[PDB]
Design an enzyme around this catalytic site. Structure first.
Site, PDB file in Angstrom:
ATOM      1  N   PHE A   1       0.817  -1.201   0.000  1.00 19.01           N
ATOM      2  CA  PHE A   1       0.000   0.000   0.000  1.00 19.01           C
ATOM      3  C   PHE A   1       0.863   1.268   0.000  1.00 19.01           C
ATOM      4  O   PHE A   1       0.335   2.383   0.009  1.00 19.01           O
ATOM      5  CB  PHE A   1      -0.968  -0.021   1.189  1.00 19.01           C
ATOM      6  CG  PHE A   1      -2.090  -1.039   1.059  1.00 19.01           C
ATOM      7  CD1 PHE A   1      -2.267  -1.807  -0.101  1.00 19.01           C
ATOM      8  CD2 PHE A   1      -2.988  -1.210   2.105  1.00 19.01           C
ATOM      9  CE1 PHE A   1      -3.323  -2.743  -0.198  1.00 19.01           C
ATOM     10  CE2 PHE A   1      -4.041  -2.123   2.010  1.00 19.01           C
ATOM     11  CZ  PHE A   1      -4.205  -2.888   0.862  1.00 19.01           C
ATOM     12  N   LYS A   2       2.184   1.089  -0.035  1.00 19.12           N
ATOM     13  CA  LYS A   2       3.125   2.220  -0.079  1.00 19.12           C
ATOM     14  C   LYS A   2       2.682   3.389   0.790  1.00 19.12           C
ATOM     15  O   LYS A   2       2.604   4.542   0.355  1.00 19.12           O
ATOM     16  CB  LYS A   2       3.395   2.623  -1.523  1.00 19.12           C
ATOM     17  CG  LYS A   2       4.160   1.512  -2.263  1.00 19.12           C
ATOM     18  CD  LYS A   2       4.638   1.931  -3.621  1.00 19.12           C
ATOM     19  CE  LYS A   2       5.341   0.794  -4.318  1.00 19.12           C
ATOM     20  NZ  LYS A   2       4.484  -0.418  -4.420  1.00 19.12           N
TER      21      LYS A   2
END
Ligand SMILES: O=c1cc(O)n([C@@H]2O[C@H](COP(=O)(O)O)[C@@H](O)[C@H]2O)c(=O)[nH]1
Ligand SMILES: O=c1cc(O)n([C@@H]2O[C@H](COP(=O)(O)O)[C@@H](O)[C@H]2O)c(=O)[nH]1
Lengths: 219, 218
Positions: free
Chosen positions: A64-65
Site C-alpha cells: 500500500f506504499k
C-alpha cells in the site's frame, strides 16, 4: 523472518477477481507469499485478502506504499491488518514519524512492516535515490527489520543490503518486466517480487517454474 | 475547481454510518469531500458512489499515489471507475510516475492534484528539501492542481509563488495540526479540514465557526 517459498513473491496486480484467483491458484505449488496492492484492492475490495487466505493459505503482503501523516498512517495500517494482511509496505520518504506510526500499529497487532527505500522505476532517480541510503539508515535506527529495494539497480540494492545488515529481510521488485535479473538480484535480496512476467504469461505456472529453475542453485 | 466556502471536508471516519451522518450534518456548508484510505479501506470503493448519490458533492480521492508508472495507471483507473473527480498524487517518486496519473485523468475526464510538501513534522526530513523542485516539475508537466501545508505558511507561500496565481492550491493542516484557516487562505484557494470538524461535539457548529472566521475571505 518470514519463510518465503522458493525466494519468489508473486505481485498479483490483475484487477479482475476471477483472473487474479485463477493465476494465483495456478502458481500456488511454487509460491506461498503473495503481494496484493491497490490495483487489485481498489478493484475488488479488502475482502480479496480474505478470499486469498481462504483459497490458498498464502501469506499476504499488502503493498500500500503508505505515505501519509502519522495519524492517517495509523488508520491505514489498522484497516489493513484488520482485513488479514500479514505485512504492509510503507514509504520512508515521508520521514521517521510516519514510519513509526506504522511500526506502532504493527507491534500492537502482531504484524510486520516493510520499509520501501529506493524504487525501481526511472523516476526514482529524481528524488528518492538521493534520500535512499538515509531512509534505510533511519529504518535501521527505528528497528525496522524488513525492507524493499530495487532489482533494476543491483549496485544500489547492494549498498542497501550493506546498510540494513545481513540479518534484515530484503525483498526486491523489478526483475523481468522492468529489466532486472533474478539471479543477480538474489545475491542481495532474500526474495524477488515478480508480477507481469508471471501473471501475463500464457502459462503462469510454467513462467514461475522457469524462474525457479534459473535460480535453483540459490535455493 | 470551484470549492464552496473554500472548505474541503476530510472525511477520515472509518465507519460508514458515522461518515454519512457527519457529512450530512455539514452538507449545507460544503460541496467538496476528500475521501482517503481510512474510509475506503474500511468500507470499500462503493462509498464514493454513495456520497455522490446522497450529496452530489465533488469527490477528491486522497490516495497519495506513490508507485511506479505502470501501477500508478492502474490505481488511477480503479479510482476514477469508482467515481472520484480527482486524485492526489505524490511528486517525490518522480516525473514518470506523475505523468502516468495525468494520462489516465485526461482519459477519464478527471483532475490530478500534486502533493508537494506535507504538513507533518517528518516532512522536514526529505520532502521539504525536494518540494520546490517537485513544484517546478509540476509546472513543467502542466499540472494545475497542487497540495501544500497549512502548518508552514512560508512554505505554502513559496509553493504559491512557484505555481502562480492561476494554479489551484489546497492545503491540509488547519485545526488539529495547528494551522490557521485565515492565514492559510492568504495562499491556498481552499483549506482541507478533518478532525476539527468530524471529531467536534457538533460538526455543523464547527464547520459554521470556521466559515465565520474566514467570512471576509469569501
Ligand atoms: O520500487 C518498486 C516498489 C514496488 O512495490 N514495485 C511493485 O512491484 C511490482 C512489480 O511488478 P512487475 O514484475 O510486473 O514489474 C508492482 O506491484 C509494483 O507496484 C515496483 O515495481 N517497484
Ligand atoms: O500534507 C498533508 C497531506 C494530506 O493529504 N493530509 C491529509 O489531510 C487530512 C488532514 O486532516 P486533519 O484536519 O484531521 O488534520 C488527512 O486526511 C490527511 O491524510 C495531511 O494532513 N497532510
Amino acid at each position: 523472518v518470514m519463510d518465503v517459498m522458493n525466494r519468489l513473491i508473486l505481485a498479483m496486480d490483475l484487477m479482475n477477481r476471477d483472473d487474479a484467483l485463477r493465476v494465483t491458484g495456478e502458481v500456488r505449488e511454487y509460491i506461498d507469499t503473495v503481494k496484493i496492492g491497490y490495483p487489485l484492492v481498489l478493484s475488488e475490495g479488502m475482502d480479496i485478502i480474505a478470499e486469498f487466505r481462504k483459497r490458498f493459505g498464502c501469506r499476504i503482503i499488502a503493498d500500500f506504499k503508505v505515505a501519509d501523516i502519522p495519524e492517517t498512517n495509523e488508520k491505514i495500517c489498522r484497516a489493513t491488518f484488520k482485513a488479514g494482511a500479514d505485512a504492509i509496505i510503507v514509504h520512508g520518504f515521508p520521514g521517521a514519524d510516519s514510519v513509526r506510526a506504522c511500526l506502532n500499529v504493527a507491534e500492537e497487532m502482531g504484524r510486520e512492516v516493510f520499509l520501501l527505500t529506493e524504487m525501481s522505476h526511472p523516476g526514482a532517480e529524481m528524488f528518492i535515490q538521493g534520500a535512499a541510503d538515509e531512509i534505510a539508515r533511519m529504518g535501521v535506527d527505528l528497528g525496522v527489520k524488513n525492507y524493499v529495494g530495487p532489482s533494476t539497480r543491483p549496485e544500489r540494492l547492494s549498498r542497501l543490503r550493506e546498510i540494513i545488515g545481513q540479518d534484515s529481510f530484503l525483498i526486491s521488485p523489478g526483475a523481468g518486466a522492468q529489466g532486472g535479473d533474478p539471479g543477480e538480484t538474489l545475491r542481495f535480496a532474500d526474495a524477488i517480487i515478480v508480477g507481469r512476467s508471471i501473471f501475463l504469461a500464457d502459462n503462469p505456472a510454467a513462467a514461475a517454474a522457469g524462474i525457479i529453475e534459473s535460480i535453483k542453485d540459490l535455493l
